[PDB]
Amino acid sequence: VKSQQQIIDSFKQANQDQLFQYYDSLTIDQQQEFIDQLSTIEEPAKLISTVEQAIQFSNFTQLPNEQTASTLDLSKDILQNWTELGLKAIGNGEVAVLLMAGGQGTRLGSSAPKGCFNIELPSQKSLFQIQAEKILKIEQLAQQYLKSTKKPIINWYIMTSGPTRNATESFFIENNYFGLNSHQVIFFNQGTLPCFNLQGNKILLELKNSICQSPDGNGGLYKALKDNGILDDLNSKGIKHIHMYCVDNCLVKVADPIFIGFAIAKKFDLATKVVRKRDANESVGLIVLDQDNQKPCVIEYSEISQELANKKDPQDSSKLFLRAANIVNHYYSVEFLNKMIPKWISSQKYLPFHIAKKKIPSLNGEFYKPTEPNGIKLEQFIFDVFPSVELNKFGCLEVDRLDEFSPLKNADGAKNDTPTTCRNHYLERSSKWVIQNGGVIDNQGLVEVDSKTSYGGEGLEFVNGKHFKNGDII
Template sequence: MTDVRKSFIEAGQSQLFQNWDSLSCKDQEKLLSNLEQISSKRSPARLLEDCQNAIKLSETNSSKDAGAEIQPLPSTSYESLIGNSDKENEYFQVGLEAIGKGEVAVILMAGGQGTRLGSSQPKGCYDIGLPSKKSLFQIQAEKLIRLQDMIKDNRVEIPWYIMTSGPTRAATEAYFQERDYFGLNKGQITFFNQGTLPAFDLSGEHFLMKDPVSLSQSPDGNGGLYRAIKDNKLNEDFEKRGVKHVYMYCVDNVLSRMADPVFIGFAIKHGFELATKAVRKRDAHEAVGLIATKNSKPCVIEYSEISHELAKRRTKKVY
């Protein structure tokens, strides 16, 4: 345990031990144990370095950077199906065939609480005000059932992986159990937790304390999904089930087409390893991001990062 304390002090985090002498022996052990859990995966120095790099990347990753070259994606990388019913039907059949073979799974990112919605429950439990009073979870479960019913020649159960967090895991599982999994088979649903990361001050130079014996931690966001897939061995489960394609979405996207056969068929037909779906922008200043390239690399430019000049551009060469 002395090595744990030493590693944090050497990383410039002596503030974590400013109350050390006033702590009981039990609380001293608890503090060191909590710090050890944090540092067992990555050293304090590495965590700080990662945070600093993220801050630098954020500062330089704005489209307002005069030196950045923002251009549309290559024409071979995207397609619009608006007004193209033949292509839409073609992709639909390809996607539906993959679903019928059991090759498609769905991942739902549902780790958040409904705090901003005025609810203490997991966000997926929220009643969005429909006459039916159905929650987000119920709406999405019924979409999955409907899609399964579309497979006429084979009884298929689409695996549904639901990412929760520490504060929402128990409540989410209880919600599904109390409602008999909304008619789905319990065995096709897998709950798993997203990871957490320690919180830093705005400079990214110091860890923040939750209380005298533990660091403040927060869920690692949607970007932590891939680590969570690895840590929870979901990739091994994909292989065991024969899953080749995974459709991912966020719980508050109530309009999401679960395991959308058209979208999946599009990705399969073109051999894309990764694909994303977007709505067409209605006007220059609509608050939606852009999928484009920055310095010849694919990127997403948030609407808050788009300069006024860039937002108005309409030429074929540059957004």
């Protein structure tokens, strides 16, 4: 739309003259490539103004009992009822899953997308394959429940970022989508945001003809859904329910019928899963009620005070007051998304920029890697839109952590959330399932239940009285 010079001028008017410090020494091709990159930034002056306001701008209680439920407390009949509602929805092609895999998992230090990571289970399955097989399995369980001739389809929308896209897609193709239909696995990229200097008023140059940019946070998912036509696809296919989740959880129950059934039974617009907080210092957001506006919301682990994090429950001193840990497992009604996404992406009121100090290798005038944080990355949080839902339309399901949540965040060597803790948890869960179904594991070993065999412990009646050894795959 605008000329090359018009773009340059709009950045200079926004006081970003440093970006053109080496412009004249660049070849014409590098210049054109540079401005093309700058042109993707919609409204520079406004963005910078917003980042600045965000920087110079930086009463909770527990959610009402009416909006919460726990799989630890519900009777089998109630859980079965929800399961059936969930399976029926799946059986009618009304369910889609949305996988957030745009993160670069810096803490883990892997060169490949976290989803490809191998926590070294006997099966050597990557996180992506486990999730793929969970999807295939639940489709089959729904088909069996409804007695369908063919299995229903759960479209799997995978949100990648520029840096994880190629490897991610190439990985699924090389593995033939792990058994799923190629058409049901749909990739789409989330956007990016420019990185700024510590002061937060200047965009950082990565190279002489390139600015630093990073994935705009999982909160950038809503805009990516609209812009990539995913929302249109949901409507086109008649999908009514979508399960959004985090790629790092090796235990995740993708498209959990219990979770979907919970939302349908209660007619929720939005629902989220939580587990009991490990300890005051666990790096997890907490689901709470904002008493000032009487709206549900999440307080991120990095923006909570030690005092609030450590406060004990006044009605039970043995527990932390705020202990509903966010495990990034969200349910959204498609209708709710059709109605709200236009609003959410139209202002910071729902998706404010969160500031993160980072060590960003960039231009000094030469490229370099710092030892101290030299810039900031901007991020929108997926849950910041929660307050916009009506309290009575928001659900919070507490689940069993050992059965549903073991995140891979750190490289081996750390105390928690490592490939080892994930592997151990995965094997312990599998082993518990086998024992409960009468299976005998010799020499106190640990076995692995194949995701191709059981979704969550069901259909394991054949192991009763049967012997297994440490390392077996069932």
